[PDB]
């Protein structure tokens, strides 16, 4: 009946002075915009239709045309930035924020979804949506004793949108909006639905990216414990943002890092550093590097959990991006460690696979490994063992590699390579 009209048909009807005639055209447009193959967004936009759709949102008399507009407008907003902009320019935002008060669950849901697309577009629209006052009524949808009395899809949509109000970084969302959203966020972080937990972690993940003052906000809400339970989840859609949250937190202050360690995160890392999904492995190793870039108290916790063998493991055989992070892990460790701690690292077999990576087409990593190899030698001088150490490096082919690096297209690489040969060979 209303399946596959021409856009010319949709325009003729929507322009008619007949509300039921308009409703059937707006239902045609919606079915156009939600088809599987390429949706005709630009023809709709160019047909001049966004303003009449935006006006249908305010027809509280006709509940069904509100829904079909909301939906249509949602799907237009789901396109390119130029396209979302068309929807925003039509005056859609204040209109959708009104729809949040609707007595019809399926309409308020749709307005949530729509605001989600609009804030998702980037910093400027996110901020505009908040300036129009969306946060107050969004959160009021969640003001219930028990979240489980809400419908799955409803809650999930509502979570996704809140999550886009946290996204996009510079400029990061207003501290004031974050302060207000965090209690509801912390609450969602405890709901048992994998999709809700996924998008909650993504939000925290978004918030904890950036300046340590931002990290503090989150950590002071005491979510670090719950994040670590999520770190041990079995659903990779949950583990991934949970892991990026934890990893963001440990780029902050030592006291912030210690909240993570104190919460037992290190117990999960044998699993994470041998995880089949490459993206997990790379981010777990990155996390390790910012822990080994900490206090000696804290490095020692890495040791006691027997994580050094896993780092040696990753250095040996991961894909390159992960190995690059593993080098930093080792350089940071040899920068802040005990005499005894650098000895342990060597006794776990760090030297052989450290050298294999001196044969890599990247200067960035070579710079890192050379600095690491340096700090080991410096601890070798403090214990008078630089003889035994220089043997190992030669006996595994390291010097074959190191020597040939003086002849390298780089300043501080040729420098530090031959600086070693001087003082030790």
């Amino acid at each position: 009946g209303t399946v596959n009209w021409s856009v010319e048909d949709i325009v003729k009807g929507i322009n008619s002075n007949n509300l039921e005639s308009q409703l059937q055209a707006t239902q045609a447009a919606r079915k156009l915009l939600s088809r599987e193959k390429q949706p005709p967004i630009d023809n709709i936009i160019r047909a001049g239709l966004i303003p009449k759709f935006v006006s249908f949102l305010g027809k509280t008399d006709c509940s069904p045309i509100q829904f079909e507009s909301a939906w249509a407008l949602t799907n237009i907003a789901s396109g390119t930035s130029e396209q979302t902009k068309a929807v925003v320019d039509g005056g859609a935002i204040p209109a959708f924020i009104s729809l949040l008060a609707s007595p019809h669950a399926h309409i308020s849901e749709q307005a949530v979804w729509a605001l989600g697309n609009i804030a998702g577009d980037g910093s400027a629209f996110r901020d505009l949506v908040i300036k129009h006052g969306a946060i107050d009524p969004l959160l009021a949808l969640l003001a219930v004793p028990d979240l489980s009395t809400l419908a799955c899809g409803y809650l999930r949509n509502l979570t996704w949108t809140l999550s886009n109000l946290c996204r996009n970084k510079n400029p990061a969302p207003p501290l004031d909006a974050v302060e207000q959203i965090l209690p509801t966020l912390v609450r969602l972080l405890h709901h048992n639905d994998p999709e809700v937990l996924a998008d909650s972690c993504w939000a925290i993940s978004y918030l904890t990216d950036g300046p340590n003052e931002r990290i503090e906000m989150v950590v002071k809400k005491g979510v670090v414990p719950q994040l670590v339970k999520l770190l041990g989840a079995t659903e990779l859609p949950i583990v991934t943002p949970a892991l990026r949250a934890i990893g963001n937190i440990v780029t902050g202050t030592d006291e912030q890092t210690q909240k993570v360690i104190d919460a037992g995160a290190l117990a999960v890392f044998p699993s994470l550093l041998t995880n089949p999904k490459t993206n997990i492995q790379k981010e777990a190793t990155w996390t390790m590097s910012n822990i080994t870039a900490g206090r000696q108290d804290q490095i020692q916790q890495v040791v006691n959990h027997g994580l050094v063998p896993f780092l040696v493991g990753v250095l040996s055989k991961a894909d390159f991006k992960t190995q690059k992070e593993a080098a930093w892990a080792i350089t940071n460790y040899t920068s802040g460690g005990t005499v005894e701690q650098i000895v342990y690292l060597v006794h776990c077999g760090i030297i052989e696979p450290l050298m294999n990576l001196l044969s890599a087409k990247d200067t960035k990593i070579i710079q890192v490994i050379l600095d690491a190899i340096s700090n080991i030698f410096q601890a070798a001088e403090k214990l008078g063992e630089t003889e035994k150490l220089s043997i190992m490096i030669e006996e595994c082919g390291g010097l074959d590699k190191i020597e040939a690096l003086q002849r390298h297209e780089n300043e501080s690489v040729y420098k530090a390579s031959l600086n070693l040969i001087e003082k030790y060979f």
Binding site: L33, S34, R35, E36, P39, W71, T74, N75, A77, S78, G79, T84, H106, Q110, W113, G116, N117, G120, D121, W160, N164, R167
Partner: peptide, 9 residues
Amino acid sequence: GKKRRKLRR
């Protein structure tokens, strides 16, 4: 995933 198109109720 930044944006989402609704394809069915």
